[PDB]
Amino acid sequence: RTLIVTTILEEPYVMYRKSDKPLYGNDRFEGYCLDLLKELSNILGFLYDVKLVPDGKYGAQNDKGEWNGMVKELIDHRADLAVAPLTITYVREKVIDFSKPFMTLGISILYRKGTPIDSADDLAKQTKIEYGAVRDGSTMTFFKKSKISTYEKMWAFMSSRQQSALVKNSDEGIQRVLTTDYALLMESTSIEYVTQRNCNLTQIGGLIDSKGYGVGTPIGSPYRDKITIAILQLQEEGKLHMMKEKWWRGN
Amino acid sequence: RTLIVTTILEEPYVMYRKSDKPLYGNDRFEGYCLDLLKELSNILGFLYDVKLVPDGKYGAQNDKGEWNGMVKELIDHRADLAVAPLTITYVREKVIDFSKPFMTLGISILYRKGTPIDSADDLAKQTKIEYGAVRDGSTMTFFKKSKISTYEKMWAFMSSRQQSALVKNSDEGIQRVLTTDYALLMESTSIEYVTQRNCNLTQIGGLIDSKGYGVGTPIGSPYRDKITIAILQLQEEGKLHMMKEKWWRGN
Ligand SMILES: Cc1cn(C[C@H](N)C(=O)O)c(=O)n(Cc2ccsc2C(=O)O)c1=O
Ligand SMILES: Cc1cn(C[C@H](N)C(=O)O)c(=O)n(Cc2ccsc2C(=O)O)c1=O
Ligand SMILES: [Br-]
């Protein structure tokens, strides 16, 4: 069985290689997730074929309980594995299985260096410095659903200054940080990626929530536990660390 | 079925309550893991009986491939679950199953506030400041097995200054930090716990490795996936955050 692997274009996890060389199949891609998949394929001994998810989505549910994205590919048995920056969540675990996480992360703060600011509590109580998140993204939703008083304050501040504090995407938010007095709340993984490439920018404080990216499989898949095993081996042998450094390290 | 839960005395996860009131069974204990277990017991609907592991050990293997600690309790079917600060590792996954992690952590640096020191790379290249770990503990072993050049340098420095840099236990190491020019490499969870209670001490840099604590079960247990589900619900609903703050927050 050649395993069909669903994934999604997302830098630096999955990208088309910058080459016009005759590269076919899996060879057309590169990135953290491609390196992970090679390691998994060597530990477990499976052949695989990478297929980008046709609708370009991660996976969310509608009211009929209909799914889309990589999640739907697994539900329909069109893919055997999903290897992507795909968050392990309660709702998704209802319909697919996940390996244990190959990467842990959480919401954090992107801001300029040299400022007395040290946490979200420092941002919350003031207003001279604007702070927000990408509109309708995982980070905005966390704040909106939060019942922790300090994040409740941060939300009301975002949603009131709605038109200005909530950016359209990460690019815009990053632009806003460099060009004005603004702090972007985003996934720690993304922040590390930007800070490595922008010496004017830095991460503020620690992690605001916690979640992991895991390899998705259909419910009952005999590969899920094997992939957890392989992930633990890679972590313990320092290979996940080097794979992250390979793709994250900047100039 | 009343589930038998193995666990281990370890502050602030599991402690005897400071009371001479007539408390029996599970009521004799308190701590993060007791609160987690109550939440799990309410989400899943199970009765349980907490039993401290008789040999007081987490779980390690000997040459005959014989295990001890909470791991051995699960292997022998004397316990249905292990709920403790028990790290999910490749070797243990060979003999027991684990839920996904309820807490993520990694090795980090405990040091005084106000010093220009910002990471392990800052410690590695110098020698005016001693730095080490608890002798024969998980953190020492990581450095000893490491193939990352910068941690290879940190190890040779520890193992040469062996008699002085490698402390006997966390208490001693913490004492060494407060009373001399020394930095202790220890689990981030433990560091946060100390820093909350010692305003003279602080965490340096980020996480050096990554691992999680999970609930252990025998291989094949029908409770493992249910516990992962409950854990994700608790995380997403901010309950793991509040349980951690309850036990970690200092004066
Ligand atoms: C790499 C990556 C994947 N994903 C998809 C997400 N992990 C998922 O599984 O649906 C994501 O939401 N963000 C964060 C994000 C993207 C647009 S807004 C936003 C946020 O953090 O709010 C990412 O950075
Ligand atoms: C709470 C806790 C559990 N454990 C046990 C460990 N999680 C295990 O699963 O065996 C541990 O090794 N440390 C760290 C530790 C203890 C003595 S030395 C040391 C270290 O970090 O080297 C802890 O702080
Ligand atoms: Br799992």
Q: For residues A22 and A81, state if they share a domain.
A: yes
Both B206 and B220 in a single domain?
Answer: no
Residues with CB under 6 A from ligand 1: A 10, 58, 85-87, 133-134, 137-140, 170, 186-187, 190
Domain that holds residue A94: 1-105+211-251
* Separation of first and last alpha carbons in chain B: 41
CB atoms within 10 A of CB A170: 19
Domain co-membership, A70 together with A101: yes
Token pair 């992991």 is at which residue? A212
Distance from the alpha carbon of residue A134 to the mean position of ligand 1, in angstroms: 10
Closest of A51, A100, A101, A99 to residue A76, by C-alpha:
A51
Whether residues A212 and B236 touch (CB distance < 8 A) is answered with no
Number of residues that make up chain B: 251
B interface with A, Cβ–Cβ < 8 A, is: 88-90, 93, 97-98, 100-101, 104, 146-148, 209-212, 214, 225, 228-229, 232-233, 235-238, 240-242
Q: How far apart are CA B214 and CA B227, in angstroms?
A: 9
C-alpha pair distances (Å), B99 with each of A102, A228, A237, B203: 15, 11, 22, 29
Strands ordered across the beta sheet of B47-52: B47-52, B2-7, B81-82, B216-218, B96-98
Treating both helix axes as pointing N-terminal to C-terminal, what angle do B239-248 and B224-236 enclose, rounded to 10 degrees? 80
Alpha-carbon distance B56 to B213, whole Å?
18
Using CA atoms, how far apart are residues A81 and A89, in angstroms rounded to an integer?
16
Residues A206 and A221 in one domain: no
- Tally of domains within chain B: 2
Grouping H, G, I as helix, E, B as strand and the rest as coil, residue B138 is: helix
Tokens of B17: 């309550």
Q: How many CB atoms lie within 10 A of CB A173?
A: 26
Check if the beta carbon of residue A236 is closer than 8 Å to that of residue A20.
no
Q: What angle do CA A107, A112, A116 make, to 5 degrees?
A: 90
Which residues does A contribute to its contact with B (CB < 8 Å)?
A: 88-90, 93, 97-98, 100-101, 104, 146-148, 209-212, 214, 225, 228-229, 232-233, 235-238, 240-242
Distance of CA B45 to the CA centre of its chain: 27
Q: Are B83 and B29 in contact (CB under 8 A)?
A: no
Backbone phi and psi for residue B173, each to the nearest 5 degrees, phi listed first? -60, -40
Residue whose C-alpha is closest to residue A38's, from A10, A5, A11: A5
Q: Which two tokens mark A101?
A: 């996480």
Burial classification of residue B15, based on how many CB atoms lie within 10 Å of its CB (0-12 exposed, 13-18 middle, 19 or more buried): middle
> Which candidate from B100, B237, B241 shows the least CB-CB separation from A88?
B100
Distances (CA, A) of B213 to B13, B26, B84: 12, 21, 8
Q: Token digits for B95?
A: 């003999």
Residue A138 alpha carbon to ligand 1 centre in Å: 6
Q: How many angstroms away from the CA of A240 is the closest CA of chain B?
A: 10
Q: What is the DSSP letter of B99?
A: P
How far, in Å, CA of B247 to CA of B201, rounded? Answer: 18
Same domain, B5 and B33: yes
- How far B102 CA sits from the closest chain A CA (Å)? 10
If asked whether residues A199 and A221 sit together in one domain, one would say no
Record: contact A210-B104, CB cut-off 8 A:
yes
Burial label for A100, CB within 10 Å (0-12, 13-18, 19+), is: buried
Residues B198 and B179 in one domain: yes
Q: Please report, to the nearest 10 degrees, the dihedral formed by the alpha carbons of residues B65, B71, B73, B75 taken in order.
A: -60
Residues B227 and B204 in one domain: no
Instruction: Tell how strand B81-82 and strand B2-7 pair up.
Output: parallel
DSSP A142-185: HHHH--SHHHHHHHHHHHHSHHHHSBSSHHHHHHHHHHSSEEEE
B93, B98, B101, B104 alpha-carbon torsion, rounded to 10°: -30
A75 and A93 part of one domain: yes
State the residue for tokens 């996936």. Answer: B225
CB contact under 8 A, B212 and A240: no
Give the Cα separation of A237 and A44 in Å (integer): 16
Task: Give A223's contacts (C-beta < 8 A, 6+ positions apart).
Answer: A3, A44, A46, A80, A81, A217
With CB atoms and an 8 Å threshold, state whether B210 touches A238.
no
Q: What is the CATH number of the domain that holds B162?
A: 3.40.190.10
Q: How far from chain centre, in Å, is Cα A17?
A: 20
- The bound ligand whose nearest atom lies closest to the alpha carbon of A232 is 3
Experimental method reported for this structure: X-ray
Give, in order, the Cα–Cα distances in Å from B42 to each of A42, B38, B97, B98, B222. 42, 6, 22, 20, 17
Ramachandran region of residue B173, left (φ > 0), alpha (ψ -120 to 50) or beta?
A: alpha
CB atoms within 10 A of CB B240: 22
Residues within 6 Å of ligand 2 by CB? B 10, 58, 85-87, 133-134, 137-140, 170, 186-187, 190
Q: Which of B33, B138, B191, B215 has most ligand 2 atoms within 8 Å of its beta carbon, as the pocket-test mutant?
A: B138
Q: Which of B30, B80, B44 is nearest to B219 (CA)?
A: B80
- Span between the terminal Cα atoms of chain A, in Å: 41
Q: How far is A139 from chain B (nearest CA, A)?
A: 12
Burial group, residue A22, by CB count within 10 angstroms (0-12, 13-18, 19+): exposed
DSSP string, A97-126: EEPSPSEEE-EEEEEETT-S--SHHHHHT-
In 3D space, the residue among B75, B82, B93 whose CA is nearest the CA of residue B67 turns out to be B75
| Co-location of A1 and A99 in the same domain | yes
Does B113 share its domain with B196? yes
**A86 lies in the same domain as A125:** no
Is residue A212 within 8 A of residue A87, CB to CB? The reply is yes
